[PDB]
From Swiss-Prot, chain C:
Protein name: Hexon protein
Record's miscellaneous remark: All late proteins expressed from the major late promoter are produced by alternative splicing and alternative polyadenylation of the same gene giving rise to non-overlapping ORFs. A leader sequence is present in the N-terminus of all these mRNAs and is recognized by the viral shutoff protein to provide expression although conventional translation via ribosome scanning from the cap has been shut off in the host cell.
Induction or repression: Expressed in the late phase of the viral replicative cycle.
Modification Phosphotyrosine, positions: 89
Subcellular location: Virion; Host nucleus
Family classification: Belongs to the adenoviridae hexon protein family.
Species annotation: Bovine adenovirus B serotype 3
Known function: Major capsid protein that self-associates to form 240 hexon trimers, each in the shape of a hexagon, building most of the pseudo T=25 capsid. Assembled into trimeric units with the help of the chaperone shutoff protein. Transported by pre-protein VI to the nucleus where it associates with other structural proteins to form an empty capsid. Might be involved, through its interaction with host dyneins, in the intracellular microtubule-dependent transport of incoming viral capsid to the nucleus.
Subunit and partners: Homotrimer. Interacts with the capsid vertex protein; this interaction binds the peripentonal hexons to the neighboring penton base. Interacts with the hexon-linking protein; this interaction tethers the hexons surrounding the penton to those situated in the central plate of the facet. Interacts with the hexon-interlacing protein; this interaction lashes the hexons together. Interacts with host dyneins DYNC1LI1 and DYNC1I2; this interaction might be involved in intracellular microtubule-dependent transport of incoming viral capsid.
Signal peptide (residue range): none
């Protein structure tokens, strides 16, 4: 990565993090806050995303 | 309806078939669309309105 | 330490028990089961074909993809008369007959 | 009013039976994730 | 006297402009709804909007 689309501090790109957050919790457009506990379950994205 | 028949040792299954009136109507409105309806009047798998 | 031996970063992420999601919405948001797309005339009145192409890290032992296209799998159960049970199945985006 | 609807079946809370909201029947849980 | 026919309903929702739609359910109210026989000969009562 030279231009720097890596998101968070991991290997994943920004445009995939935005899609994953939008698909799972609908967060991307209005910030990147942590989703509430009831929305974050075992078959979720941030429940298992370990950089 | 009940049937009594000669007994044979090997297990068997009865094949009574009810002569329903099975008909399908095919209508093709326009350019590659095909739509059909089915009616089996005595024994049908129908739908509501 | 002062006696260090250079440096070379390498970052990675480890996501487990998660199906990667690509919703068929214009804004990628989840604002309804019958999505924004898949309901307008462009994608619900004409024919189209996918050519999805996957690039992925190599694994020595044979693997297999698990692309599952999210569809509308619905069933309707009707019980007209004391032991008659009739059920209608309809899977919309990938037809499964009647 | 208890004759025009099923209000005797619902548990009471004094004199007012505890019915559900009208738009309470039905459910929809569905996602691939 | 045969019951007068009831109009069929077709609503609009999203881009979908011709969805078949059944008449909405309403709790019975004597002020708004009354029980009228479908066929006068045999009693099959049902609610109508007067």
């Amino acid at each position: 990565d030279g231009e720097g689309y890596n998101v968070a501090q991991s290997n994943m790109t920004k445009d995939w993090f935005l899609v994953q957050m939008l698909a799972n919790y609908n967060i991307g457009y209005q910030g990147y806050h942590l989703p509430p506990d009831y929305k974050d379950r075992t078959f979720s994205f941030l429940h298992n995303f370990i950089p | 309806m009940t049937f009594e028949m000669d007994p044979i040792n090997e297990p068997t299954l009865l094949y009574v078939l009810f002569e329903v009136f099975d008909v399908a109507r095919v209508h093709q409105p326009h350019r590659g669309v095909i739509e059909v309806v089915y009616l089996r009047t005595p024994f049908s798998a129908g739908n509501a309105t | 330490d002062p006696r260090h031996a250079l440096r070379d970063p390498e970052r990675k992420f480890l996501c487990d028990r998660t199906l990667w999601r690509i919703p068929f919405s214009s804004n990628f948001m989840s604002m309804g089961s019958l999505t924004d797309l898949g309901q307008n005339l462009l994608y619900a009145n004409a024919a189209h074909a996918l050519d999805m192409t996957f690039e992925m890290d190599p694994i020595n032992e044979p693997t297999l993809l698990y692309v599952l296209f999210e569809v509308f799998d619905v069933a309707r159960v009707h019980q007209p008369h004391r032991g008659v049970i009739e059920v209608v199945y309809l899977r919309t985006p990938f037809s499964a007959g009647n | 009013m208890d004759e025009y609807n099923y209000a005797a079946l619902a548990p009471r809370q004094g004199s007012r039976p505890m019915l559900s909201q009208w738009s309470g029947i039905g459910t929809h849980e569905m996602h691939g994730g | 006297e045969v019951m007068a026919p009831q109009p069929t309903l077709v609503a609009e929702q999203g881009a979908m402009k011709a969805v078949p739609v059944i008449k909405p359910a309403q709790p019975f109210t004597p002020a708004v709804h009354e029980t009228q026989r479908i066929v006068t000969n045999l009693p099959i009562t049902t609610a109508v909007t007067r």
